[PDB]
Every structure is written in C-alpha cells, then in structure tokens.
Structure 1
Amino acid sequence: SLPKWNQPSKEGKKITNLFVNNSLTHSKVEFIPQEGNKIKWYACGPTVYDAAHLGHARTYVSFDIIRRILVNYFKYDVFMVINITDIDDKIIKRSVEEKIGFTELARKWEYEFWEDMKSLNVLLPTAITRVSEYVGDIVKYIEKIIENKYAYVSEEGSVYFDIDEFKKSEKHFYARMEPLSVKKKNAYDFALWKSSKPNEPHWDSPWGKGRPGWHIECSTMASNILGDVLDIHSGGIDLRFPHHDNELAQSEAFFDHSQWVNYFLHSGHLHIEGLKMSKSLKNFITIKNMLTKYTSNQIRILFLLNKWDNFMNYSPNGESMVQCIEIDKSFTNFFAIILMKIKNFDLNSCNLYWSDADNKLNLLFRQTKNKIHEHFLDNFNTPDALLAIQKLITEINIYMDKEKIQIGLLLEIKHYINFIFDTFGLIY
C-alpha cells in the first residue's frame, strides 16, 4: 500500500553528491543521471489565454536558476522541453467573449509569455511543443493505453483512464506524489480524450470528434522527445495533484513500466497577503506591471532569497522588494569599483609583493567558493549562496579601498562572481 522509488545506478554516471527534494520520495535524495552526465527535463508550460503574473514568474525563474546551476555550475548536459497549452477550455471561453479565434488568442498570449520570460532573463528550453501540433500524436498515445487495457471508451466518444485497472497491476501505483488526494466506471477516473460538442473546436479521432484531455498532452509530448525515462520533471506544487500524478499514470500505462520520472521537483506556492496569487482571486500582479516598478535583477533576487521548494509570502508595496533593491545596489556598486580598478591599474607604479592582506582576502575567496559549492549541493540553497557572495563583497570592498591591490587577485575574484551571477541569471 506504499509506493516505491528506485534510485539510478551510480556506475558510469556523473556523481556530484547533489541532493534534491524529490516529491516522489518526499525527501532529499542524491541526484544520479539515468545516462552519464545527461539530464532529460520536462517542464509544464503556460496555458496561453491571458498574461503571466508573479506566481508564474516564481516557477519559471526558480527552475531557470536550477537549470543554470545544473548546466553552468555542475556542467551537466541538460535537454529541456516545455509545452505550450494552446488548446484549453479557458482559451475557448475567452475566445468567444472577445469574439476572436482560438488560435489568434493563443498565439497572442504565447507571444507575451515568451517576451515576459526574456524580460526576466529566463533561458528558452531546448524544445517547445504546442498541443495543437501534437494532436495526432496524442491520439496514438491514447490508442496504446487502450491497447494495454488501462483505458476505456464511453458511448459519447470520450476516452477515460481506468484507474482501477491501473492499480491492480503490481508494477503500477496511482497517485504516487499525493496518494491521499484521491457513466464512468469510477468517479476518480479522468479523461484522456473528451468528446467535443459540435460548437467546440475538435479533431478527428477513432472514437469521434474531440479534444485532448487536461493531462494527456504532457505525457505524449515528453515521451515522444525524451522517451521512457525522464531525469527531471518540474512544475508548481499545485500541479503535483492531480496533474502530474496523472501524467505518471498515463506514461506508465503507455510504456507498461514502473518509473517514468526519476526526480519530480515542485516549486513552492507564491502567496500575496497569505493567499495564493490567482486570477480568480484578483490579487495577481502581472510580470509587465512588476517590471514597471522593479528590475529583472531585483525580481530574480527575490526568488533567490526564497528557497525554490519552500513556501513564499510576497508583501506588496515593495516591502519584500526593499531587501532585493539593497542587494542589487550592493552588487552594482561592487562591480563598478572592481571593474574600474582592473581597467585603470598600472603595473609599473605598483608594488606586487604578496602581503598578508592579499593572503587573507585570497583565503576568504577560496573559502567562499567552497561554501557556495556546499549550498548548491544542499538542494539549490541559493539564499545562503547569495549571502556568501555578500559577505565576500564586503571584504573585497575594504581591500580595494585601503590595501594595496594585487590586480591578478581582483581579476580572478571578478571572474568567479561573474560566473556565479550568470548561474543566478543576474546581469550587471
């Protein structure tokens, strides 16, 4: 009555001693690639029917940071895929009210979403998959689930996942990450294919005209590009159930195996004034509106200060952003001085003896490098790594103001801090 997780074998794999909070094990576990240093990563993407707000930014910026740590810092080989849900009930409903076509609405808000991501310096994934371009692939995916006896077709033409048949199999467990949250055979069964009314958009299928169900999209596209095993699957914690648990059931049924994803990472909720940021609650702040008050670096520092997997509470009116603006100011001033000193330094006039002051700054510099390395291994502890950089910057500023300058030491410190800020997504 308990789900089981199998860790990848270490032989032949890049091992960093990295530990990540995995929602499958509900614990921190060592991260081991399925193959060598490669990481196959699928991330759930936006439903392009409206603007993105700060909550969305929290997920996409937080996992953008984690990706930068994995690639830039640990030198993993990351293959990332994000879907665009351009077919949806919300897209259909908004398109009729606006009296614009479904595809025209979806492409407009898809465009604004990628513009907003670029404004926050979120790297684009390796592959972008639209649901509208994979409808035929979704049908074939559903056909195989039916062939495996894990799906049934209703009279109206819909197709439903058969949870009961899925559970009976010993190899398969349903609702791994949220076990307690759990005309059809069973109420808890969900639709792989929805029979479309004549007034709704539809696609031809063996079972009749219809639309893809909520969850089938991600399982189809991720399996086609990445295959039977995914190293990482990311998303917001809200998507954990029923969305992601249903992705696992669909892909396990399709491949008839036990583990579709080795590591499931979930970003914490963003609450504004104690309630989750939601369009329905009307407490949302769009990414564009946030950018008219704050810079991209400041917004990224906000998410660096709140651990990616933890709960976060945003205080509006700039209460939470006050610290972010102070840190951004400290980084900006530090880079100004160190860059000017490196540029203007004159070797002939200076004395290049290696003094105790030089040795002390050098020892703290190597010490800070190790502190940050432990923090990144500690489930991407960016808040403490950011504090480590600040402590180092305080001592470098003292050294630049008073001590005689070892130009090479400062140049090497600048290269490191630039390397860490590229890992954070900061641009100075």
Structure 2
Amino acid sequence: SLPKWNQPSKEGKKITNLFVNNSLTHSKVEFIPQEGNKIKWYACGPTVYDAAHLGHARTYVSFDIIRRILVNYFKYDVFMVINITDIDDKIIKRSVEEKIGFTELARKWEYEFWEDMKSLNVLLPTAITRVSEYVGDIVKYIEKIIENKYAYVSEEGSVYFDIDEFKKSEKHFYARMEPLSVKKKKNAYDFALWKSSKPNEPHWDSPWGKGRPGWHIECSTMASNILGDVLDIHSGGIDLRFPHHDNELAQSEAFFDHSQWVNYFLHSGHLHIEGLKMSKSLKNFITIKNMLTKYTSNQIRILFLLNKWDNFMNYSPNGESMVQCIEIDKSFTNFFAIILMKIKNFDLNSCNLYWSDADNKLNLLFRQTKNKIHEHFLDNFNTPDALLAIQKLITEINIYMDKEKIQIGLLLEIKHYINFIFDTFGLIY
C-alpha cells in the first residue's frame, strides 16, 4: 500500500557519503550513482511566454549551486538536460492576445530566460530540449505506452493515461511522491498524453488525429530519449512534485515497464514574498531584470546561499532581505582586496619567513574550516553553514593580515581555497 524505493548498490560507484533530501523517500538518504561517478540529471525548464522572476531564479540558481558542488567540489560527472516548453496553453493564449506567432513569442522569452540565467552566472545544461523539436518523439513515446496497455484513445482523438491499469500492476505505483494528492475518461484522475486539437490551435499529425502533447509527456519523452531508463537526479520546484513529476514517473515507468525511473528526486522550496509564493498569477513578482537593476549577481546568489535549497524562504522587498546580502558581499570584496594586494606587493628579498605560532594557529583554523565545509556540503548541500564557516575564517585572516608578519605561501593557499569555494557557490570577485 506504500511505494518502495531501491537504493542503488554501492559496488563500483563513487561514494562520498553525501546525503540528500529525496522526495521519493521523504527523507535524507545517501546519494549513490547508478554508474561510476556519473550523474544523469533532468530538470524541468520554464514555460517561455513571459519574463522570468525572482522565484524562478531561486530554483535555477539553487540547482546551479548544487550542480557546482557535485561537479567542482565532489568531482561527479554530471550530464544535465533542461527542457523548454515552447508549446503550451499559456503560450497559445498569450500569442493570440499579442497577435504574434506561437514560435516567435516562445523564442523571445526563451532568449530572455537564458540571458537572465547567464546574468546570474547560472551554467547552461548539457542539452536543451524544446517540445516543438520533439513532437515526433513524443508521438512514438505515447504509442509504446498504449502498446503496453497503460493508455487509451478517446473518440475525439485524445490519449489518456490509464491510472487504474497502471496501479494494478505489482511493479507500478501511482503518485509515488504525493500518494494522498489523488466524462470521456475511465476515471477522473486520468490525464492526457495527447490532446485533440481545435482546428484553430497549433497541432501536429499523429495516429490518433491532429493534436498537441499533454502537459506532462514531453518531459518523460525528452529525458528518456537522451538519458535513458534510469535518471540519477530529477529536479524542479516543490509545486511540480504532484501532479507533474509523479505523472512523469508513471509515464516513464509505463514506457519502460519497470519500477524506478528516477533514483533521487530533488525539490527546491518556494520563494515567498509577503507570505505568498511569488507568482505571475498573483502579480506579486519581481523580474530578474528588475532585480539586477538594484542588486548584483553576487548579492542575489548570496540571498539564495543563505537559504537552504529545499526549504521555503521569505523575501522581504524594499531591500530588507538584501541588507545582509550586501554586507556579506562587501566583506568578501574587502577581504579579497587586501589579500590580493598583500600577495602582489610581498617582497621575498626583505621578508622573514620563520613559521611562527601565529602562522601555525591560522593554518590550523584554515584546515579545520576545510573539514567543516566538507561536512556542510555532505549534509544535503548546507550552503548557509558553509558560507558562515567562510565568514569566520575571513574574520581571522583579516586580523592576521593586519598585525602578523605574513606567510606569503599560506595566504596564497588560503586565497586559492576560498576562490575554489566561491567558484562552487557561483560568486565572482
């Protein structure tokens, strides 16, 4: 009566003892690759009909940070796919209102989305998969689900996922992550894989008649084609966990007729503003472009570094939440300023380099900080505590650079380590 989860075997895998909050187990579990040190990762992308806002930035920056930790810090090999939903009810509606083609609208806002991601120093994925370029593959994917008897065709030419038939199989469970969230249909919970199109909507040919992909089928199709029958990581905001992500699991399990398409499903918490999710529907949003006319990429990234990725966060506007971010950014700027100059202007001809007790004490705190930050990253990507550890180290380095005769090589190594962590955070100084 309750979904089971199979932890990957550790034999032959890279083992870091990283633990992650897995929505499939609703618990922190040890992260174990399916193969070697490889991570196949699919993340749901935006629906490109309007500008992106600070809530979208929170999800994509948080998972950018996680990806940098996985790759730059732990040395996993990440193969990442992000889709672009450039066919959608919202795009169609917006495009008639503005009297422009569906493709021209979608391409503009896809362009602005990637520009906003680049402005926030978010890395592009390995592959970008647009629905409009995968419609043929989606049709073939649906044909296989029908052939496995997990979907049916209505008279109008739609295709619906057959929840009851899927559940019946002992190898399949429907709504693995939110079990409790559950006329032409067998049962009302059945969802469309293929929607019969009105003659005035954009549409594509199919064995069942002119139509469009359903809301969820594109993500199973694209991830399955490129990454295959087992994903190490699948990610998105928490609102997508059900119906969207649970439905992806059902579609993909039905396609491959197996029991676990995704090993680790990661859900970022929502950014709220004045207690409510930042949302285009609520008209309480701040565009990323507007945010960047007031704050820098570094300051915005610090905002997200200070909030655990899988917890919700409150954003207080009019600069309230950003006060701390600006202070931290300023302290990092001034630290780098001093250490860079002290290194550049250091004179080996006239210095004394005896390794003193003050040098030893700073070095001990330095190596200790490396170990604290390691534990924070293993603890479900705990960037708030890792950032605080960096701040504490910087406080002591600043004292050391002011009074003690300075060990040039120790400061260079410290600068390189803090640079390494800031690269992992996505900060640029």
Shift of 1:74: 0.1
Q: Which residue matches 1:119? A: 119
Shift of 1:59: 0.3
Shift of 1:110: 0.3
| Runs of 4+ residues deviating >6 angstroms | none
Query: In structure 2, how many angstroms separate the alpha carbons of the residues matched to 1:311 and 1:283?
Result: 17
SS of the residue corresponding to residue 16 of structure 1 reads coil
Deviation string, structure 1 residues 388-408 (Cα, Å, up to 9, x no partner): 000000000000000000000
Query: In structure 2, how many angstroms separate the alpha carbons of the residues matched to 1:341 and 1:426?
Result: 22
Deviation string, structure 1 residues 27-65 (Cα, Å, up to 9, x no partner): 000000000000000000010000000000000000000
Query: In structure 1, how many angstroms separate the alpha carbons of the residues matched to 2:342 and 2:97?
Result: 60
Query: In structure 1, how many angstroms separate the alpha carbons of the residues matched to 2:16 and 2:280?
Result: 40
Query: In structure 2, how many angstroms separate the alpha carbons of the residues matched to 1:90 and 1:350?
Result: 67
Q: Which residue matches 2:344? A: 343
Query: In structure 2, how many angstroms separate the alpha carbons of the residues matched to 1:113 and 1:289?
Result: 13
Query: In structure 2, how many angstroms separate the alpha carbons of the residues matched to 1:173 and 1:404?
Result: 66
Corresponding pairs, count: 428
Query: In structure 1, how many angstroms separate the alpha carbons of the residues matched to 2:178 and 2:402?
Result: 55
Shift of 1:257: 0.1
Shift of 1:113: 0.2
Deviation string, structure 1 residues 151-205 (Cα, Å, up to 9, x no partner): 0000000000000000000000000000000010010000000000001000000
Shift of 1:348: 1.1
RMSD: 0.3
Query: In structure 1, how many angstroms separate the alpha carbons of the residues matched to 2:289 and 2:98?
Result: 22
With normalisation by structure 1, the TM-score equals 1.00
Query: In structure 1, how many angstroms separate the alpha carbons of the residues matched to 2:337 and 2:178?
Result: 49
Deviation string, structure 1 residues 225-245 (Cα, Å, up to 9, x no partner): 000000000000000000000
What's the % identity of the aligned pairs?
A: 100
SS of the residue corresponding to residue 68 of structure 1 reads helix
SS of the residue corresponding to residue 47 of structure 2 reads coil
Query: In structure 2, how many angstroms separate the alpha carbons of the residues matched to 1:233 and 1:342?
Result: 43
Query: In structure 2, how many angstroms separate the alpha carbons of the residues matched to 1:318 and 1:18?
Result: 35
SS of the residue corresponding to residue 242 of structure 1 reads helix
Deviation string, structure 1 residues 46-93 (Cα, Å, up to 9, x no partner): 100000000000000000000000000000000000000000000000
Query: In structure 2, how many angstroms separate the alpha carbons of the residues matched to 1:5 and 1:396?
Result: 46
Shift of 1:306: 0.3
Query: In structure 2, how many angstroms separate the alpha carbons of the residues matched to 1:75 and 1:258?
Result: 29
Query: In structure 1, how many angstroms separate the alpha carbons of the residues matched to 2:263 and 2:62?
Result: 20
Query: In structure 1, how many angstroms separate the alpha carbons of the residues matched to 2:39 and 2:99?
Result: 43
Shift of 1:314: 0.5
Query: In structure 1, how many angstroms separate the alpha carbons of the residues matched to 2:235 and 2:303?
Result: 20
Query: In structure 1, how many angstroms separate the alpha carbons of the residues matched to 2:218 and 2:237?
Result: 17
SS of the residue corresponding to residue 286 of structure 2 reads coil
Shift of 1:331: 0.2
Query: In structure 1, how many angstroms separate the alpha carbons of the residues matched to 2:164 and 2:378?
Result: 40
Query: In structure 2, how many angstroms separate the alpha carbons of the residues matched to 1:29 and 1:121?
Result: 29
Shift of 1:272: 0.2
Query: In structure 2, how many angstroms separate the alpha carbons of the residues matched to 1:234 and 1:120?
Result: 19
Query: In structure 1, how many angstroms separate the alpha carbons of the residues matched to 2:109 and 2:254?
Result: 33
Deviation string, structure 1 residues 88-111 (Cα, Å, up to 9, x no partner): 000000000000000000000000
Query: In structure 2, how many angstroms separate the alpha carbons of the residues matched to 1:47 and 1:224?
Result: 21
Query: In structure 2, how many angstroms separate the alpha carbons of the residues matched to 1:129 and 1:175?
Result: 25
Shift of 1:256: 0.1
Give 5+ residue unaligned stretches, structure 1: none
SS of the residue corresponding to residue 424 of structure 2 reads helix
SS of the residue corresponding to residue 388 of structure 2 reads helix
Shift of 1:264: 0.2
Shift of 1:125: 0.2
SS of the residue corresponding to residue 173 of structure 1 reads coil
Shift of 1:311: 1.1
Shift of 1:300: 0.3
SS of the residue corresponding to residue 232 of structure 2 reads strand
Q: Which residue matches 2:128? A: 128
Give 5+ residue unaligned stretches, structure 2: none
